Design a protein around this ligand. Structure first.
Ligand SMILES: CCCCCCCCCCCCCCCCCC(=O)OC[C@H](COP(=O)(O)O)OC(=O)CCCCCCCCCCCCCCCCC
Ligand SMILES: CCCCCCCCCCCCCCCCCC(=O)OC[C@H](COP(=O)(O)O)OC(=O)CCCCCCCCCCCCCCCCC
Ligand SMILES: CCCCCCCC(=O)OC[C@H](COP(=O)(O)O[C@@H]1[C@H](O)[C@H](O)[C@@H](OP(=O)(O)O)[C@H](OP(=O)(O)O)[C@H]1O)OC(=O)CCCCCCC
Ligand SMILES: CCCCCCCC(=O)OC[C@H](COP(=O)(O)O[C@@H]1[C@H](O)[C@H](O)[C@@H](OP(=O)(O)O)[C@H](OP(=O)(O)O)[C@H]1O)OC(=O)CCCCCCC
Ligand SMILES: COCC(CCO[C@H]1CC[C@@]2(C)C(=CC[C@H]3[C@@H]4C[C@@H]5O[C@]6(CC[C@@H](C)CO6)[C@@H](C)[C@@H]5[C@@]4(C)CC[C@@H]32)C1)COC
Ligand code: NA
Lengths: 511, 149
């Protein structure tokens, strides 16, 4: 139920050897709450939640288990009230976890941050953040304390918070300027070049350079053999492809057909794979004679369209651009719904005009072009008086040519005054919910961004081939960011602080 | 050159009349609303600039495949795709009717890319910008009134 990487305490070989020849339990309330939440007894689970230690971990695990059990019951065609009960339980436990986190942050910030990232030895060594992410608890990650922790993790071991970005750009462009930067309490270069923000800016500068090189080889003339810039672009795409392969083979599951199906869950990866394959086809067709060379040039142009569009993924790091990108993503669905009606009206008018004006046309593929060309360019400000309804010395007049301007008047009225204004109304009156959901989703996906940048190698893709060959050398032979190992005194202090926090929360709620 | 500097400098002294207009009880708040919607419009114009550059590069690369490297290449990318979205859509200046002139390879993609670009730049982004202006207007109005007073 819990997930893939999870490994419960019962199935460990220590417990298996204990159970083979047969004690007690160190923490009994963990087992009792797991039992109470597996047998769909809610009030007993809520009673067992407030006893013992590691209360937040218990709340998150209960939420995940309730969600998984609800999904399983819905899949196995149960009474369909069990699903509602289990979802209610999951929401209750999630709300409890969020309230407890809020109380902990409002009491003491530093201990609250330390509480969310210490390794949990009883839950297969996962921090509270990983448990919250595995349960898709958006309200927990989007809290102020979690966002502050993510910011402090993303900034790395640096100390620039008043105005970043420009300082990092100046450091990466002027290496003698790195030393004049304050750090957090030879070895000041390895720490700077491993902060995730520095990796992100290195990757962004590499991508901008790659796009600048790509926009030069298509505008200017091409030759029989590729120039230097074309070789640089090809090398960049090849290294990006082998990096994608490395990312696939370093996944979480152990099955090749399971790692692939979990990597093909974000549409960016699928589109990147399609673009790389299409560019490979274009490059193969490029190193040929004249017609195949022209076709390769065309494939290069379309691939350039895609790589230009892919800059919104880079833009998403901003605090004000990501939500607008997601709003665009949903308004695309709304616009796709309305374009069907607009296309129906457009096809109707186009067919009527083409049939009225030209009554002696042989059947040709050009007929399918006049239906869509003019009626589509007409509603974008290109309305002509001679290209349609021509002034029929004078040319002969087709029968019924006086209907075309009237049909055009009706079509323009119904396509430029009614449908577009209704679409504006739809965008306007369904905007606040989309804005709030987009903010929540972006604040949640900041964690995925931070992790996927901490995992990446130091060098950018143009010169990543050096870091890939060092992977072979280190193969034949998480201090912070993911977990935070602590001693026993710190563990006891954290446990006492958590007990005080939960007791104060219950007292305040009762009051 | 001095005459040109005069003709460019006159624009600022024309624009500065809004500072004179600010004394009115109904014009100052609108000026400040314009001031904030300028920031919103910049944030929503970066994306349109990205899409415009993409379409311009695609058209310029497809149509003209034998261009020597010249500074005029940077003009055809931004000129036509920017004038196109303001109602100046033409049927012969883009996708020319290729006795008849020879047809460039892949010339049938340019109208399709143009259709997609016009749909995504005149129906989606501008309407979303209208929604952004509309749903973040009351707070701006109140703050502008307070600041003017
Ligand atoms: C199928 C793609 C083939 C690519 C190879 C040929 C490319 C030629 C056509 C270019 C199409 C590129 C669009 C790809 C964007 C899809 C990315 C995605 O789905 O992520 C969802 C992504 C979220 O997924 P999640 O956050 O990971 O869950 O949401 C978005 O960001 C969508 C908003 C960005 C796209 C809006 C602008 C699209 C303009 C396309 C019109 C063409 C303009 C030409 C001038
Ligand atoms: C940097 C300026 C160089 C001027 C010399 C060359 C001028 C050529 C370009 C003209 C640019 C003039 C715009 C200057 C306005 C800025 C004033 C300001 O920032 O005060 C903020 C001011 C508030 O500051 P505060 O109240 O003192 O705190 O807010 C405003 O009033 C901004 C709203 C008025 C400007 C909107 C219209 C601008 C149109 C410019 C487009 C060019 C049109 C050409 C046709
Ligand atoms: C074509 C462009 C393609 C690349 C575009 C790359 C995409 C891109 O635009 O990234 C922006 C990048 C992000 O930096 P980032 O958001 O992490 O930094 C925040 C920013 O400095 C805010 O001004 C801070 O205060 P506030 O929020 O105002 O209150 C905020 O502090 P806080 O509030 O969190 O405490 C900072 O976290 O830096 C810039 O903002 C502008 C400098 C960019 C300079 C470099 C320009 C090239
Ligand atoms: C190109 C123009 C450049 C210069 C433009 C200069 C910028 C400009 O337009 O100034 C306007 C100026 C301001 O005068 P001001 O606002 O101080 O006077 C207010 C105005 O008379 C209102 O009508 C009054 O009542 P209410 O508010 O209606 O209830 C209000 O009384 P109260 O409510 O406070 O008790 C008065 O305070 O006078 C005019 O209004 C129009 C006569 C202008 C005649 C001159 C026209 C040239
Ligand atoms: C009149 O004759 C000119 C001649 C000098 C010609 O030199 C050429 C050198 C390459 C250069 C500067 C030229 C035309 C296209 C230019 C591209 C436009 C692109 O735009 C940008 C646009 C925006 C970017 C996002 C994408 O790329 C460039 C990477 C790209 C760009 C600036 C690369 C550089 C290209 C001119 C004079 O010498 C006697
Ligand atoms: Na128009």
């Amino acid at each position: 139920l819990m997930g893939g990487a999870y490994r419960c305490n019962y199935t460990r070989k220590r417990f298996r050897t204990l159970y083979h020849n047969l004690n007690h339990f160190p923490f009994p309330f963990h087992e009792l709450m797991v039992w109470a939440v597996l047998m769909k007894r809610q009030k007993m689970a809520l009673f067992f939640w407030q006893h013992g230690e590691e209360a937040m971990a218990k709340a998150l695990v209960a939420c995940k288990l309730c969600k998984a059990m609800a999904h399983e019951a819905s899949e196995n065609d149960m009474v369909d009230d069990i699903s509602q009960e289990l979802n209610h339980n999951s929401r209750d436990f999630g709300q409890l976890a969020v309230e407890l986190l809020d109380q902990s942050y409002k009491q003491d910030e530093q201990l609250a941050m330390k509480l969310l990232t210490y390794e949990l030895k009883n839950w297969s060594n996962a921090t509270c953040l990983q448990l919250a992410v595995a349960a898709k608890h958006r309200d927990f990650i989007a809290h102020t304390c979690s966002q502050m922790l993510l910011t402090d993790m993303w900034m790395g071991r640096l100390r620039m918070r008043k105005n970043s970005g420009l300082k990092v750009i100046l450091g990466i462009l002027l290496p003698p300027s790195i030393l004049s930067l304050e750090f957090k309490n030879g070895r000041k270069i390895y720490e700077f070049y491993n902060a995730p923000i520095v990796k992100f800016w290195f990757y962004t500068l590499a991508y901008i350079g790659y796009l600048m090189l790509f926009n030069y080889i298509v505008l200017v003339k091409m030759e029989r053999w590729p120039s230097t810039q074309e070789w640089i672009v090809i090398s960049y795409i090849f290294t990006l492809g082998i990096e994608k392969m490395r990312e696939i083979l370093m996944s979480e599951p152990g099955k090749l057909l399971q790692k692939v199906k979990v990597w093909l869950q974000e549409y960016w990866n699928v589109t990147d794979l399609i673009a790389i394959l299409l560019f490979s086809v274009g490059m193969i067709l490029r190193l040929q004679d004249q017609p195949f060379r022209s076709d390769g040039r065309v494939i290069y142009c379309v691939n350039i369209i895609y790589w230009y569009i892919r800059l919104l993924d880079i833009f998403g790091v901003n605090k004000y651009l990501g939500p607008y990108v997601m709003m665009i993503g949903k308004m695309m669905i709304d616009m796709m719904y309305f374009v069907i009606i607009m296309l129906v009206v457009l096809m109707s008018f186009g067919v009527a005009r083409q049939a009225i004006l030209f009554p002696n046309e042989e059947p040709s593929w050009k007929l399918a072009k006049n239906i869509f060309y003019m009626p589509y360019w007409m509603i974008y400000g290109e309305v002509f008086a001679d290209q349609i309804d021509p002034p029929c010395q004078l040319p002969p007049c087709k029968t019924g040519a006086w209907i075309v301007p009237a049909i055009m008047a009706c079509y323009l009225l119904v396509a430029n005054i009614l449908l577009v204004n209704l679409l504006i109304a739809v965008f306007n009156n369904t905007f606040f919910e989309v804005k709030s959901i987009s903010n929540q989703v972006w604040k949640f996906q900041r964690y995925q961004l931070i992790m996927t940048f901490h995992e990446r190698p130091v060098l950018p893709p143009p010169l990543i081939i050096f870091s890939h060959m060092t992977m072979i050398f280190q193969h034949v032979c998480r201090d912070y960011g993911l977990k935070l190992f602590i001693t026993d005194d710190e563990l006891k202090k954290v446990h006492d602080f958590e007990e005080q926090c939960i007791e104060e929360y219950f007292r305040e709620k009762d009051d």
